[PDB]
Design a protein around this ligand. Structure first.
Ligand SMILES: [Cl-]
Ligand SMILES: [Cl-]
Ligand SMILES: [Cl-]
Ligand SMILES: [Cl-]
Ligand SMILES: [Cl-]
Ligand SMILES: [Cl-]
Ligand SMILES: [Cl-]
Ligand SMILES: [Cl-]
Ligand code: NA
Ligand code: NA
Ligand code: NA
Ligand code: NA
Lengths: 314, 314, 314, 314
């Protein structure tokens, strides 16, 4: 048995770029848009529906309510708030946790028993929050984690070596935020280790690697400073996560998942790690052999998230 | 010989929804984004590029300048301005005509010799302006016209009769604006005339038709009033027009084209009519047998646009 | 709830062209191949599986047994036999009916409760046979009927008027065989009636229509005489029927369906008529207004099939 | 500038499975089929054309002659002969070399200046022959090499570890034939080296690797013995090679290429190696660090092909 219904909670540019990308890719049959501003969600459903006669797939799209979650295979949460003038980061963190809690309680009230995908920032902490408040098994609750950071990394590398970015197999791990890091010890192009690529190609050197990490680190800021917000990138990352689940792919993607003893960092954190996705959610987390530097960086990143969660009394 | 490069002029939500939809559909290989705010166009190119590692097609995407138009197969113009406090409609009409003129002169300076597609509103008058200022043959300059209105119509009909909207073959003709009208005399579902569908199906009646026309008429307003602007719909319409040209389809779509004696309304207006699109642009305009009411409505619509153009001293 | 499993019974070139086309289009997730020659089905599954690492969709493909039908959403039957030296047409007709009966009993034994799609020839009579032997409701048993004849017709017309064949909306109706006929009274290009197209375009005349009918009539023979058998065409027709069902499209396609009083020809025959397909099978048969000639031709075609069925004591 | 025309020479099941797969994937716009049996090629073009009204892309498909190669971007050669009763392997090798020579001379006579892709067996020797007889630069002449063997390898590995085969990044190198070998030293799943996968997963062990190599070695025989010939697998491999070129991907695929000093085996052989493909053909061969065993195996494989070529007085 298979499901083909996704509910999107929050119709800001992240949720709607995701929805539009799904419409253009024909990812699923049925889409339901939820927003605290019901009129806005209705307008967004009109605007999506009006392009369908030109789209690749027959779809059913509507604005709905939490009761529409009941038989949804996936709910994607993008809701949250922005820092107010004078507001501390812990205060805001707590306001976003309360929003996620409320969304998740409303989703669970419907009878929903599918998978939760959190894209709201800070995504690692909010995925943990959603996991705890949902009562669901952690293999059924994920966050988008470093999937977009990873796509950025592949893009940047591809510009040095002029190889299809889809042939670049390297991950950003850890917190989706300032403490993320590149796993260079397990990076290849095609089947070829990155260290060998560096030795072979004049196009890419050791110095470029640190530059690329910085570019990946600064990418969100850079986009926000130029066009107010970033959303096309995450929209396609969320589509890809969705497709791995509905197409039952057993695809390896870096996403926010509960470590739970897989890596030797903090067990009780959601954090960006490569994981196998299929129709049932997370099949398992892939355990990479990290070098000493990367393991240290993963520990640092996990400690940071665990402190955040402690401070939110989670 | 084939081209696979599109330039988008103006990176507001219409131009960028179009670009993102192309990225998700893999419509063409190469995309160049132009905007008077160069930093903004650069941010938009970053945000699109970051989703490519998850996209269906290898692409080259960058922010560029008018010189990048030189070997573009298609330039899509979305630039323009909004009414200022106190501004007359003729004043604003003239300010938009001057913007189009300037864009088009800059495009032609590059050596460009491809096709122009105008999506800026009011699209029928601005397509005529672009045609005149470009010096190009009118088969190489088009506007998006009533292609989106037509998709809306198909969507609305599909909701009554519960048939795939892509099986609904009916057009909105005329001005993309208040004087557009439904061509009911040439409308079918599958191969079946709409009048026969009405007789057969309890699901749809003569009264529903006038309602559907009103819904189509009010659709933009409705969306704008709920989410500030409409853009997902036109984005997919522009993709479809683009695909008909780059895939050399000889596809019939209702778009803004120079009447030029095909219908018996004003010859010297661009107006929404069904037309055959292929790699060379407009192969010919399809001439439908209109009934007396529709012919009158087309004349009214053409007269309105011709008066607009006169008033702009075109 | 949605299904994504198809079983193919008979792995000759029709069944396997269908399967390969599905693999290349990514139509469904799961495919099971059945053949009385188990080793052959296993070889075909190997050969399909080996292309998947290059395919657009993750799939599960295997050779199986009738018990694999139990949770299949669709079983496509292509099994049957060829005329032996000296064999009468009624004898062979009866040998094919017994094969279909046996296949269908074996399918039903599994607990299967999905949709049956018969492609074996003569498809209209064998669809009726499959319907009767299955015990299923007639909306859940169909044949491929004149869907391919219809694609041929659209192709031929497109070559005269140089319009995308997918914009040509015209049907072949009746028996998939010598008594099929073109429904010219309900034929259009885009939204434009074919009679108007003829008047407008020097490219197509009344004389061409009879020629086109003859071409469509002779197409199978022509292909068989040049490459031994026809199978790429039907393979893509079967994919399209499958996609209408699994994508729940409410798509109108001409297929073999039980008339049952919809048209005024024989009620108890399966015959090629336009029908609405969705995830539940046939939603309804579309009733076209036929002209006097076409109605007569449909009656002739139905009488022929009814005589065939009588002669088989169905 | 971009091309979108492919010519297929030889319409047996390899050439036609390739063509049909392209039609179902919409790989290119224009297809021309050539065969010494012109009637057969015409029948194959009919059978393909008849499915287009149901296909994803508008296409132009016809049977043609060598003059149609003139503006083709790619010619795919599948022509050749089978061993006769009593015939030595060197005799037959020479008969196939003469066929390739004749095809290639006829292609070059047209004015063709695109890329040659040889799929005829033995593909490595015949790619060299085509290269020499064509007068073209070796970056513009390739063979399908071990691309299919590689897809088989990925499929087999995926069945042990239950990961999307498209996440399995490992190559078969060398002769497409008995002396091919797995490059285990440069094999990963996602970004994770295969040795680490073996250590982590109970699902796959060192012993399985030798078994998998044997399965890959025996795959063609196995399929041939069950269904007479193998062709669906190579058909999709050829599509993938084609797509890398027409979509200008800079994609890494293992194909037959002229070693020419890249690896330290024989310089003057075509042999299966990973290579970067884009619109211009082979950008460069990727040089992997091979371990001692693999380097020896590559040398053995190259020596075998060089002896074959010597024996054919190439
Ligand atoms: Cl569903
Ligand atoms: Cl939001
Ligand atoms: Cl291009
Ligand atoms: Cl703008
Ligand atoms: Cl399923
Ligand atoms: Cl069979
Ligand atoms: Cl071309
Ligand atoms: Cl051949
Ligand atoms: Na280097
Ligand atoms: Na009615
Ligand atoms: Na005519
Ligand atoms: Na193991």
């Amino acid at each position: 048995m298979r499901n083909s219904k996704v509910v999107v909670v929050g119709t800001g540019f992240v949720g709607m770029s995701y929805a539009y990308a799904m419409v253009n890719q024909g990812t699923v049959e049925e889409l339901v848009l939820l927003d605290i501003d019901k009129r806005k969600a209705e307008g967004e459903a009109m605007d999506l529906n009006h392009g369908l006669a030109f789209g690749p797939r027959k779809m059913s799209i509507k604005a709905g309510d939490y009761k529409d979650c009941k038989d949804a295979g996936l709910v994607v949460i993008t809701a949250g708030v922005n820092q107010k003038e004078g507001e501390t980061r812990i205060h805001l963190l707590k306001r976003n946790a309360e929003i996620i809690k409320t969304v998740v309680k409303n989703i669970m009230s419907s009878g929903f028993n599918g998978i939760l995908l959190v894209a709201s920032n800070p995504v690692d902490v909010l995925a943990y929050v959603a996991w705890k408040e949902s009562g669901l098994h952690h293999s059924r609750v994920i966050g988008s984690g470093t999937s977009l950071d990873t796509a950025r990394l592949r893009y940047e590398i591809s510009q040095y070596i002029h190889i299809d970015s889809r042939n670049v197999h390297a991950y950003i791990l850890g917190e989706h935020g300032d403490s993320e890091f590149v796993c260079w010890s397990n990076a290849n192009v095609g089947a070829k280790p990155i260290a060998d690529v560096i030795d072979s190609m004049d196009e890419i050197s050791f110095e470029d690697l640190e530059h690329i990490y910085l570019k990946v680190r600064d990418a969100a800021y850079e986009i926000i400073s130029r066009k107010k917000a970033t959303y096309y990138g995450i929209g396609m990352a969320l589509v890809r996560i969705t497709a791995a689940i509905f197409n039952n792919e057993n695809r390896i993607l870096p996403i926010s998942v509960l470590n739970n003893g897989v890596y030797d960092c903090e067990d009780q954190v959601y954090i960006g790690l490569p994981a196998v996705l299929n129709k049932d959610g997370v099949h398992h987390i892939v355990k990479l052999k990290l070098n000493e530097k990367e393991n240290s960086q993963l520990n640092n990143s996990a400690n940071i998230l665990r402190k955040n969660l402690d401070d939110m009394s989670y």
